[PDB]
């Protein structure tokens with residue numbers, strides 16, 4: 001797919017059998033999703049965005065489908081205002097920016 | 100170009116006569132630049148992201164040169180940790196996300 005940017009680049013993701021909406025975000029290093037349950041252990045992480053730092057739960061090697069493409073990697077869970085797919089998983093689905 | 104996402108997609112921009120580095124950010128609705136002076140009128144705005152909100156100055160009809168391509172639109176100025184080129188200007192340079 002070729003996604004233009006006149007609207008937010010929102011896609012359907014599937015994580016834990018659940019469909020969610022997420023933003024494809026080239027300005028995010030990491031993928032951050034709103035509070036949900038994920039399996040296994042987590043490790044702490046602080047991430048810094050526009051407004052300041054937040055604490056998140058880091059889950060590694062999580063299976064996630066993004067716009068129909070399978071990825072397996074790190075998912076951060078915390079109080080983000082929107083689910084964002086960051087570069088760690090955009091690279092796994094082969095995404096590039098083009099102009 | 101085609102920009103891969105293994106690393107942050109940073110580019111050189113020219114704005115208000117100044118060269119700056121900025122992140123090409125599909126997750127940003129609007130372009131946000133670190134504190135600088137710009138000509139003309141402005142109005143206050145609050146914009147929110149992970150960590151919460153910051154107060155910015157909204158300037159309209161600002162020209163920016165992005166990676167050699169000129170674009171005009173709104174630029175927000177304030178205490179952002181990173182300069183970001185958001186969708187409002189990415190569209191004008193014909194940027195797309197492809198996978």
Ligand SMILES: CC(C)CN(C[C@@H](O)[C@H](Cc1ccccc1)NC(=O)O[C@H]1CO[C@H]2OCC[C@H]21)S(=O)(=O)c1ccc(N)cc1
Nearest residue numbers: 027028029030048049050126127128129146147148149181
């Ligand atoms: C959270 C998104 C919905 C919105 N953001 C754009 C986003 O790309 C930011 C842009 C960004 C980048 C660095 C620092 C602050 C903000 N990235 C970000 O917060 O990423 C976090 C998750 O991975 C990490 O890597 C980068 C920081 C972490 S935002 O910077 O808060 C923002 C909000 C509104 C406008 N107009 C412009 C930008």
Ligand SMILES: [Cl-]
Nearest residue numbers: 073074088089
């Ligand atoms: Cl990962």
Ligand SMILES: [Cl-]
Nearest residue numbers: 171172173187
């Ligand atoms: Cl604009």
Ligand SMILES: [Cl-]
Nearest residue numbers: 004005190193
């Ligand atoms: Cl177009």
Ligand code: NA
Nearest residue numbers: 139140159160
């Ligand atoms: Na103006």
